[PDB]
Amino acid sequence: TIPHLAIDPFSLDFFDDPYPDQQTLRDAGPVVYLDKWNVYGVARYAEVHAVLNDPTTFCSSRGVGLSDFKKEKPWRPPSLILEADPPAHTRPRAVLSKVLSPATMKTIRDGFAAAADAKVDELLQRGCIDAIADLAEAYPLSVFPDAMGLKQEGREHLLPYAGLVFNAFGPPNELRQTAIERSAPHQAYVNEQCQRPNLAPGGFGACIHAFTDTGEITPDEAPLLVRSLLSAGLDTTVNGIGAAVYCLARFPGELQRLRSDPTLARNAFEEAVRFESPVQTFFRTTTREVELGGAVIGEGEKVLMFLGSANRDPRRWSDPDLYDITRKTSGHVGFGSGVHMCVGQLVARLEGEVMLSALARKVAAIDIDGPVKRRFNNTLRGLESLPVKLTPA
Ligand code: HEM
Numbered sequence: 001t002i003p004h005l006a007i008d009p010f011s012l013d014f015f016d017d018p019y020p021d022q023q024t025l026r027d028a029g030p031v032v033y034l035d036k037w038n039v040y041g042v043a044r045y046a047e048v049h050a051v052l053n054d055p056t057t058f059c060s061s062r063g064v065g066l067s068d069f070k071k072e073k074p075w076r077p078p079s080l081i082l083e084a085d086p087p088a089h090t091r092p093r094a095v096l097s098k099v100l101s102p103a104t105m106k107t108i109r110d111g112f113a114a115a116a117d118a119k120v121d122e123l124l125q126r127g128c129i130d131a132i133a134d135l136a137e138a139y140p141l142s143v144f145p146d147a148m149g150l151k152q153e154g155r156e157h158l159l160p161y162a163g164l165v166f167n168a169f170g171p172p173n174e175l176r177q178t179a180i181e182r183s184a185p186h187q188a189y190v191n192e193q194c195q196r197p198n199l200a201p202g203g204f205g206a207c208i209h210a211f212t213d214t215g216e217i218t219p220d221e222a223p224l225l226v227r228s229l230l231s232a233g234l235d236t237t238v239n240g241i242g243a244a245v246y247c248l249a250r251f252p253g254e255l256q257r258l259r260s261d262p263t264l265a266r267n268a269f270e271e272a273v274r275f276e277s278p279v280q281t282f283f284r285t286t287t288r289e290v291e292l293g294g295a296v297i298g299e300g301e302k303v304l305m306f307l308g309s310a311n312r313d314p315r316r317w318s319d320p321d322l323y324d325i326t327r328k329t330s331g332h333v334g335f336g337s338g339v340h341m342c343v344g345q346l347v348a349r350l351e352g353e354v355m356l357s358a359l360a361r362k363v364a365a366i367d368i369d370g371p372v373k374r375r376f377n378n379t380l381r382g383l384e385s386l387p388v389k390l391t392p393a
């Protein structure tokens with residue numbers, strides 16, 4: 001009773017324009033079977049939300065990529081947070097929640113906002129820039145490694161490592177093979193910086209190690225928790241901020257509404273996360289036979305959740321293909337939902353808000369003025385190059 005589809009959601013053709021295929025995935029049924037990779041798929045909001053919020057049935061400890069850790073060796077030691085179920089997940093989650101807490105945002109906000117304002121003013125002196133390399137990448141590179149407390153040496157490995165991280169959740173296609181092959185130098189750099197002596201006191205990494213005193217994590221758990229932030233904390237925000245600028249460039253009416261009320265910056269970024277869904281997909285693995293939308297899925301099956309499709313499902317969203325900075329976005333699954341919901345969401349929103357605030361106060365127009373190039377990744381959606389001309393307000 002389950003429709004079988006041949007759509008490859010990790011193919012370059014799909015990445016290049018996923019929306020027609022996502023509708024076919026939604027409209028085929030609440031649950032589909034993807035013959036290309038032998039996994040189940042859910043693409044509607046209701047089922048994606050249900051799977052995310054049913055962690056005892058749809059577990060994370062067998063991996064959140066295609067690979068089943070019960071069957072294949074993980075490419076690196078399993079994540080203590082992303083690839084753990086409760087109760088093992090709980091205390092590492094609590095540490096990260098405290099390290100990336102509301103109280104912590106107060107300590108970094110002035111620096112993050114200052115860097116965003118300075119970057120936009122710098123770009124306005126150049127006129128014609130690449131909104132990826134010069135903005136979406138440059139700005140997070142200017143604040144997040146420092147907030148982590150990383151040394152200067154080796155930071156050139158951060159974006160390559162993240163590309164590997166997010167390609168590795170995918171199937172064994174060319175993107176994944178090429179990423180994992182000869183990835184040892186990227187892994188070695190990151191694993192070295194996770195050690196306590198290499199992390200600046202006061203930064204996120206040192207604060208993680210400081211929590212080993214409390215009994216919430218052991219000293220040998222702290223480097224892997226630092227690793228989780230170096231895996232997820234940079235490339236996500238690159239594609240989130242790039243998504244927002246791409247939206248503002250394509251919807252000039254919405255840039256003008258943002259200009260008229262810069263306090264819409266935070267929601268304008270949140271809507272960009274829904275609209276583009278920089279993190280497109282994650283998997284779960286069934287721990288038991290389970291009925292889901294009329295489908296009876298066996299134990300030990302991989303289930304692919306299309307977060308971006310859920311965020312564009314007209315069953316849930318009015319006018320889902322419209323970028324609307326005053327939309328009530330609560331309930332979107334671009335940061336996940338439930339026990340694994342993005343623990344770094346305050347850092348992501350802070351970066352996005354202060355950058356969009358700077359644009360709102362300083363920029364009158366954003367015009368695409370060069371060839372746009374898409375960046376292909378098994379998990380991340382975003383652009384490789386976005387040439388724009390910025391007109392000062
Ligand atoms: C626009 C930016 C971001 C997006 C769209 C995003 C997306 C997501 C999603 C969808 C999940 C859920 C994973 C799952 O359910 O399996 C997640 C979890 C996570 N994210 Fe974020 N993320 C972003 C930024 C960040 C930042 C800035 C950090 C760290 C500074 C971070 C660190 C993490 C970690 C450690 C987890 C694992 C949480 C857990 O398993 O409990 N992410 N993210």
Ligand SMILES: COc1ccc(/C=C/C(=O)O)cc1
Binds near residue numbers: 079080081228232
């Ligand atoms: C939202 O994407 C991600 C990606 C990776 C991770 C953790 C990685 C690790 O523990 O090494 C967490 C979230």
Ligand SMILES: [Cl-]
Binds near residue numbers: 188
């Ligand atoms: Cl690693």
